């Protein structure tokens, strides 16, 4: 039971059959996943967290990597994927629904593996991934360092659907969600107002939402999604909302979280992405690898 | 990810030339941009080349235009970078780097943000 290092395992429902590029990627390098798991629990425990040091992260990357690899050389949809310890050691599952990510948590539990993890590939929004209970979740390494990204964790997913491009977001349920973050936001920033803006520069992955159905690559244009200035009271204008994507040669997501930067009177944001290992930072936040 | 070990760093008098290489470790997929940047002393970490690992496609940060060339051998899983007409400015420690881009829209290889990286090599440029 002390923090070690050690090469993980996947475990997949993967279908030997099925020619779904993951499903044939995951049944060979994968093993069948433990139907009756399986967890300890305990309380008045706390250990040292850290998301943005964890060696799990870099395990899943260099798979998914690798599964892209071998796919592209046609059928394509992502699967839940599990990251189990060997024998000797075990994983740490933070309980604290109200953990940032980082430092102490006095309420832990112990797994062997991890849960069902899509590995979904994409830039400014998280999707198909874990929501957070109750309140809107914020996370960085630095937050006074304004180069470290920003993760923040949506307690209410908003459904998304791009096809042909263009993708549709409820108003209604959009503004809810950014006057909350403005709000979590003003917590972490005082006396400044809170702006959202479009990406301002560099690869056009980053500077749309980009993302990948069925095999195919949209790129999707953002700016009308942040361009919301919150002050003490919020609102956001923009042009339901509608983003203009472009394709490449129908699917239905739900966004589960956020990636921001903030600018070095006003303290504004844009939508960021790039370095999947965040997307992986989305749903690995909670767990930690540990020797018996 | 991928194991990155830059090497032939060095001291030359001006307007000498040197000859950096780097060498992943790991192994490199289709969708990878792999470039070089440097951090001269007292100064912040700037960019100077990039090439696509597929296509090679390459860009140069403006003030190095003309005079160095970045080369890749996917063989050897390496990268080259060619100074020649080297300036005291030109004095750094260079980074070999790279970054993983699957939904890349184009082989145009990035001027920023990477992910993985080497250790350095030393630089040292004489009036
Ligand atoms: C780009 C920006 O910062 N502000 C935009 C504005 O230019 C645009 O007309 C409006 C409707 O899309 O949404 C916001
Ligand atoms: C909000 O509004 C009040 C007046 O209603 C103003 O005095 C205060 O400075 C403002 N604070 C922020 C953080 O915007
Ligand atoms: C510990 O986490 C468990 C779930 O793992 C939860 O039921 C319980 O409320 C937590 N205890 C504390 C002290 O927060
Ligand atoms: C979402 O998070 C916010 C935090 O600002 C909270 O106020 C709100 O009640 C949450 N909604 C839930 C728990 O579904
Ligand atoms: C973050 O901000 C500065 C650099 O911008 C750094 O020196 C400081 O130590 C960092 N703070 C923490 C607690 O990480
Ligand atoms: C998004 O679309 C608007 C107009 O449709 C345009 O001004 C902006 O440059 C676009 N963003 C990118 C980089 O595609
Ligand atoms: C999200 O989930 C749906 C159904 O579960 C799936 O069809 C879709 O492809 C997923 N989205 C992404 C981007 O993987
Ligand atoms: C979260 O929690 C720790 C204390 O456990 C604190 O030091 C850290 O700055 C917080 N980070 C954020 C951004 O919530």
Redesign the interface.
């Known amino acids: 039971w002390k923090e070690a290092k050690t090469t993980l395992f996947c475990a997949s429902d993967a279908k030997a059959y099925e020619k779904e590029v993951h499903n044939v990627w995951a049944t060979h390098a994968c093993v069948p996943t433990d139907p009756n798991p399986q967890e300890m629990v305990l309380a008045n425990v706390t250990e040292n967290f850290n998301m943005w040091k964890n060696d799990m992260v ?1 395990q899943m ?2 798979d998914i ?2 599964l ?2 071998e796919s ?1 050389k046609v059928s394509f949809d992502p699967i839940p994927l599990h990251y189990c310890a060997p024998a000797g050691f075990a994983i740490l599952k933070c309980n604290n629904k109200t953990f940032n990510g980082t430092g102490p948590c006095r309420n832990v539990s112990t797994v062997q593996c991890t849960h069902g993890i899509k590995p979904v ?3 400014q929004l998280l999707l198909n991934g874990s929501l957070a209970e109750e309140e809107i979740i914020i996370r960085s390494e630095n937050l006074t360092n304004n180069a470290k990204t920003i993760i923040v964790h949506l307690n209410e997913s908003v459904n998304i659907v791009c096809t042909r491009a263009h993708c549709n977001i409820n108003e209604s349920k959009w503004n809810n969600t950014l006057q909350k973050v403005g709000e979590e936001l003003a917590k972490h920033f005082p006396s400044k107002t809170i702006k959202f803006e479009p990406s301002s520069g ?5 500077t749309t939402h ?3 159905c069925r095999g195919e ?1 949209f ?1 999707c244009n953002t700016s009308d999604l942040f361009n919301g200035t919150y002050r003490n009271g919020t609102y956001n204008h923009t042009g339901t909302i509608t983003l203009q994507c ?1 394709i ?1 040669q129908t699917c239905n997501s739900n966004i589960t979280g956020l990636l921001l930067l903030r600018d070095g009177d006003t303290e504004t944001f844009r939508p960021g992405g ?4 965040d997307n992986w930072r989305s749903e690995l936040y909670k767990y930690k690898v540990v020797e018996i | 990810a991928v194991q990155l070990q830059e090497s032939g760093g060095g001291l030359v008098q001006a307007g000498g030339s040197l000859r950096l290489s780097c060498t992943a470790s790991g192994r490199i997929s289709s969708s990878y941009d792999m470039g070089w940047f440097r951090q001269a002393p007292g100064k912040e970490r700037e960019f100077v080349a990039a090439i696509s690992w597929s296509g090679g496609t390459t860009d140069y940060a403006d003030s190095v235009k003309g005079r160095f060339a970045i080369s890749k051998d996917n063989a050897k899983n390496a990268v080259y970078l060619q100074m020649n007409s080297l300036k005291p400015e030109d004095t750094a420690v260079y980074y070999c780097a790279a970054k993983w881009r699957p939904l890349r829209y184009s082989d145009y290889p990035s001027n920023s943000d990477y992910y993985d990286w080497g250790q350095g090599t030393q630089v040292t440029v004489s009036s």
């Open positions: 870099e990357h260099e990597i690798s892209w690899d592209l590939v994409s830039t560099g690869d056009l992955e980053i980009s993302f990948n690559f790129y472009k490449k790039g370095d999947m290992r």
